[PDB]
Design a protein around this ligand. Structure first.
Ligand code: HEM
Ligand code: HEM
Ligand code: CL
Ligand code: CL
Ligand code: NA
Ligand code: NA
Lengths: 713, 713
């Protein structure tokens, strides 16, 4: 069946904005996962998971009698798709159970791990999501084998379909670099937003870069991909050595024995894949990666044996039974237990990527420090494991249950507690009138509040106006935020704040975070009034101001908008058309196509454009909230042509007289071009639509202002 | 960006069931189009459309100063995508404005027509849908040129994204037959459900079959395609000769002058396409089809000239200025007006497909009859135009406004008016108890009501339980309906009905249509009771019984389920896997994936399978409403293998003992295989879900029972 994607493969795809609809969701529209989880007996789930660890099923027998290792790997791969560049991937939506992740080669036989968990899922039902369960399983595995974890937060709601994520352009699993869809260029530069070295891998190739078993060059790949997952060198060493303290790899026989991945398997396989024709196809005969390494003398118990082995022996390159490169400690004694035969023992072995921890000079310092001080290793690993598995959960206000760690971590972009009365509706009205009487314009007020709130992304729930981080480094200096204009607006707002807070009794005060948002609401209300309409924009106080010391400047860099179509802004020239970047932004803001459409048309006429550009400002009443953008965009009396100087800027001229009327970008004109967006623009451009436009505008404005307000959830 | 479709192009696509979500819809969730249109001043719209007909815009000048022809064509192509096989296509959703139909070659320069209508759309806003406006414009064109139409109904609500339709497998526009994706096989057999001869055409190729200008062979294609759009010979001749009484074709120069279709054009084209480099690119220089034919001496006025010309001349094959095959009248004088130059005239001309109306023996008789009796022609055309443009609107209860024809037409599958008091809740309780006391089983009651209601399809809003057509030819004899079992159920119900109606005072009575549905409800209630749950099933009376004479047996044939996964039924072997057919049926019933999931698991355990097959009946308590199907499907204790005799039937055996537990089909096992369906199965299979399953089941049951209840809308 030939589709629209076949005929017009480069048209813009809006269906990414309409995923996660009430139609695909089996739970009722009032189902609240946090309320369900808050009543789960978490201890009882953990007791059942502890019992599972040593309850082997014959269809996938447990190595050494213990599934710990398998489940740790599972929870690390659930979390390890995360990319800091866009916040997509991670464990927070349980996406490992859907395509494509359920069938990535690096996820082989994690289908078995997830099936082992079905009896417990089934028992507790909707009170524990698959997403939470994957991570809790990992934690209980660690605890069962003697490792004390840093804690655990529930609250990851299940999703019901695949997320739309750019995982790369390769058309072949595990394609080595420099092919026709190479994700690498230049001096081994990985393209943003990707965070893995090959299609279907989590971070790196365990044999070495494109299969070359050089521990030193592998270290470079490790460092680059982990950094793109927001982990530094200390976290990286702790996580890899930590994880490889447990379990084993599987490569008992040749890879050509392994059949189709789950999404390609037959129906009889009932959601499992990678069925193997090698001997029994499982247990002692298992094939997963093709490597056959067991790192420690006690693979079912926490120890410091990984670093004892890594530094205590000299290593020799060898091949697994499937032919993959690995390392062995020649002239070690056979001290490693076999997974199934009590009478066999083996020599210590390592992956190329394990030896990286010893032969990269920066890693070696850390690994030596951990080797000599295993208590420091255990602490670092616990913290890094918590970060790994929580990094995409959002603000601490979303963390549920009795095991949440009380320590506030810098990476969490923490927001201080509010300990005072909040402003009420009368106070808000008074502050709004002061803001408007100060001389701040509609444009300044809407631009500033937009800049503060629009850093939110739903992928990892980072960003938003809570914290007033717009006043701090680095946000205050981002080009899109117009630093000089910004600094003058914030100086005026801070004087209003100081005056108002000074006049209060009884502890009442307003945060700068709240006032930024409230000032934005006042600007929207004034715009409406300028157009002849009396509207109240809703406002919910309770934001707090974070300090510079509570703000990791380097981690904030990934939230800088380099493209924001809502402000007609592009920081440089990109391979991706600006309209595709607009839709990507809308997706991160959690907007539907109608909401993206209303919001952009309004912003245009309110003066939100960076640099006060006239592009797309299709009105003669700038700073009045009207549907002028749409009515003028859709006027067939104007003809549009790209400019000589820039093919991405367009002149609109009267079709009869030739007179210049307007200029716009691709972001503006896509609303007149794309057949689905034009259909939405037509609604808002109709003669009966003024009231609808204003109402839908205020609602989507308010939605943006509240994107990070999990304290009110 | 590589997608799931790229990696696993044969996995099942569920996103067709979650289309038309509240996310993509710009109107509020309580927007009711029928109420909006009922307040439109239809007369005022029609005045504006009359004015438009002769208001020529320079960007697309009006042929002969009148856009009527162009608008008639536009309305006929809006309607002319309809296929009776599935009810998909047609004018009823205004899909012409979306991909792919907005860019089909046969729709060239209809983008211009629709843009001419933007000022009117804009003026009336949400009170008139594009879907309705396309047809109304057609009607007004006809009236403006002197033809009296049969009437007009509003009520086609706009849609906001492309409908999912199989339009064929060809990868090239206009591909001639016998290619690698040929829609033809055998002795020119067009594949169901298609109703056009080539990809991008409405019905047939105007030059003749695969471009061969044989009017006799073209007639064969015309008759086959029109029949697949529900039109017989008389309607076909009337529509083609009716339509070609007006306007002209456009082929002034070579087709290589014409540029990209709308979905391919640049952004500056603002939603238009087919820009032409030939001379002025428009008006006298227009190029649309490539053909250059003007049929009548007064192309802007109703006349009897089409048939006078077709029979009054002998025809000679010639070529247009673009090189297309067409015909010219031998020895005729130049009597046809030019569209733009008052000093030029032209000889009569015709398409190959026009000459079909004379050289096919059956068409010739009709065309002669119309030539000799122009009043019969005019009436047949009016009737056929109303059918064409209303065929996919559904029951007369959906028809809005003051121009609706009072005459009831057989093709409308009419339902008689109810003229007596309806049963109330006390009566329904009494009838349910009689039904249960008669000895009818849960399985008989659920199967019957399912058979009656599940003929509904949302594509053209045909079918459903209203009418009691299950008791009439041909439904009573369809294999999926189990004719012998069905006859005995209906005999029992009709005795209960006769007894009840005989006891009533005043004119209260119950229809057999209502009682079938009510008996179904009683069976679901009894099933719930069998499982230990106290459940009332909602029931809305008001269905009436249609007669045999109100039921066109040939037109009902397209509603026969040859595949119904909900009854584990397949009539024969098809190219399409049975699970794809299941999803297609769910789409026609308007079901979401969760609703399809719940409904099939329930039906299985209630005994709805055709022929009492055990396939998928994963319970030991058949006829009890439980979640057993899901709990047993997902039990990893069971292993599934395809059988020796049939690879589409599977055996489930205890994984340890080898003992046979169950059998199922691909439709059963797909819920355990496909990662999104299994995710939904897991919700209903969990230990906390029995009450949720029963509740969700009753809701989806009731939805299906009410699908055709536009009298309650
Ligand atoms: C550079 C980073 C890493 C590489 C290249 C990598 C590579 C691999 C490979 C190839 C396997 C074998 C899969 C098989 O054949 O069964 C595996 C196993 C495992 N990895 Fe990693 N790993 C990485 C980091 C991590 C981290 C961060 C963790 C957790 C903190 C983790 C925990 C595990 C565990 C527990 C197993 C054992 C599985 C079992 O016993 O079934 N690894 N690793
Ligand atoms: C076998 C069926 C038919 C064939 C093959 C066909 C073919 C065509 C073609 C090729 C054109 C020229 C497009 C262009 O170059 O502008 C056209 C024009 C037109 N057709 Fe048809 N036609 C069919 C049936 C119909 C029917 C059923 C109607 C309406 C009841 C209709 C009404 C029109 C009208 C009004 C035009 C004139 C457009 C104008 O003035 O711009 N035709 N037809
Ligand atoms: Cl994601
Ligand atoms: Cl359709
Ligand atoms: Na994410
Ligand atoms: Na339809």
């Amino acid at each position: 069946g030939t589709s629209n994607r076949d005929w017009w493969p480069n048209q813009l795809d809006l269906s990414i904005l309409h995923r996660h609809s009430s139609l695909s969701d089996p739970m009722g529209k009032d189902f609240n996962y946090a309320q369900a989880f808050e009543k789960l007996d978490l201890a009882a789930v953990k007791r059942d998971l502890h019992a599972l660890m040593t309850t082997s099923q014959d269809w996938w027998p447990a190595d050494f009698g213990h599934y710990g290792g398998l489940f740790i790997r599972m929870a690390w791969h659930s979390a390890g798709t995360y990319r800091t560049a866009d916040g997509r991937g991670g464990a927070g939506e349980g996406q490992q159970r859907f395509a494509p992740l359920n069938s990535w080669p690096a996820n082989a036989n994690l289908d078995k791990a997830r099936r082992l968990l079905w009896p417990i899922k089934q028992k507790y039902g909707r009170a524990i999501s698959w997403a939470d369960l994957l991570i809790l399983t990992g934690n209980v595995a660690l605890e069962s084998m003697g490792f004390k974890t840093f804690g655990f937060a529930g609250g990851r709601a299940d999703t019901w379909e695949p997320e739309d994520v750019y995982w790369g352009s390769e058309k072949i699993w595990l394609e080595l670099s420099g092919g026709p869809n190479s994700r690498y260029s230049g001096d081994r530069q990985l393209e943003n937003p990707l965070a893995a070295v090959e299609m279907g891998l989590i971070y790196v190739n365990p044999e070495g870069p494109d299969g070359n078993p050089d521990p030193v060059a592998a270290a470079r790949d490790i460092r680059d991909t982990f950094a793109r997952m927001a982990m530094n060198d200390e976290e990286t060493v702790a996580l890899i050595a930590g994880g490889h303290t447990f379990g084993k790899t599987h490569g008992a026989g040749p890879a050509s024995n392994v059949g189709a991945e789950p999404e390609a398997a037959g129906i009889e396989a009932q959601g499992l894949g990678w069925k193997s024709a090698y001997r029994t196809g499982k247990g002692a005969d298992a094939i997963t990666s093709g490597l056959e390494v067991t790192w420690t003398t006690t693979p079912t118990q926490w120890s410091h044996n990984f670093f004892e082995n890594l530094f205590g022996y000299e290593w020799e390159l060898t091949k697994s039974p499937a032919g993959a490169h690995q390392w062995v400690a020649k002239g070690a004694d056979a001290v490693i237990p076999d997974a199934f035969d009590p009478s066999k023992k083996h020599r210590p072995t390592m992956l190329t990527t394990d030896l990286s921890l010893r032969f990269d000079p920066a890693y070696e310092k850390i690994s030596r420090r951990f080797h000599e001080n295993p208590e420091q290793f255990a602490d670092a690993f616990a913290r890094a494991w918590f970060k790994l598995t929580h990094r995409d959960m959002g603000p601490r206000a979303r963390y549920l249950g009795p095991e949440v760690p009380a320590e506030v971590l810098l990476w969490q972009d923490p927001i201080p507690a509010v300990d005072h009365p909040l402003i009420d509706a009368a106070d808000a009205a008074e502050l709004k009138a002061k803001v408007l009487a100060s001389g701040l314009t509609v444009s300044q007020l809407v631009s500033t509040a937009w800049a503060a709130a629009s850093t939110f992304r739903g992928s990892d729930k980072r960003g938003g106006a809570n914290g007033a981080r717009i006043r701090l480094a680095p946000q205050k200096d981002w080009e899109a935020n117009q630093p000089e204009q910004l600094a003058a607006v914030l100086e005026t707002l801070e004087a209003i704040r100081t005056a108002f807070n000074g006049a209060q009794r009884g502890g009442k005060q307003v945060s700068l975070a709240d006032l930024i948002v409230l000032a934005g609401c006042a600007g929207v209300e004034q715009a409406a009034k300028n157009a002849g309409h009396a509207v109240t924009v809703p406002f919910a106080p309770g934001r707090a101001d974070a300090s510079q010391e509570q703000t990791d400047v380097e981690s904030m860099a990934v939230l800088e908008p380099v493209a924001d179509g809502f402000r007609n802004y592009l920081k440089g020239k990109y391979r991706v058309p600006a309209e595709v970047l607009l839709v990507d932004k809308a997706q991160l803001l959690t907007l539907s196509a109608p909401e993206m459409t209303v919001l952009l048309g309004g912003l245009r006429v309110l003066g939100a454009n960076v640099g006060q550009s006239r592009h797309g400002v299709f009105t003669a009443r700038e700073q009045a909230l009207t549907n002028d953008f749409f009515v003028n965009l859709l006027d067939m009396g104007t003809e549009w042509k790209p400019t000589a100087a820039d093919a991405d800027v367009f002149e609109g001229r009267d079709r009869a007289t030739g007179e210049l009327k307007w200029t716009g970008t691709r972001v503006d004109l896509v609303f007149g071009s794309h057949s689905q967006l034009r259909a939405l623009a037509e609604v808002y451009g109709s003669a009966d639509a003024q009231e609808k436009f204003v109402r839908d505008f205020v609602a989507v404005w308010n939605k943006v202002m509240n994107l990070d307000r999990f304290d009110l959830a």
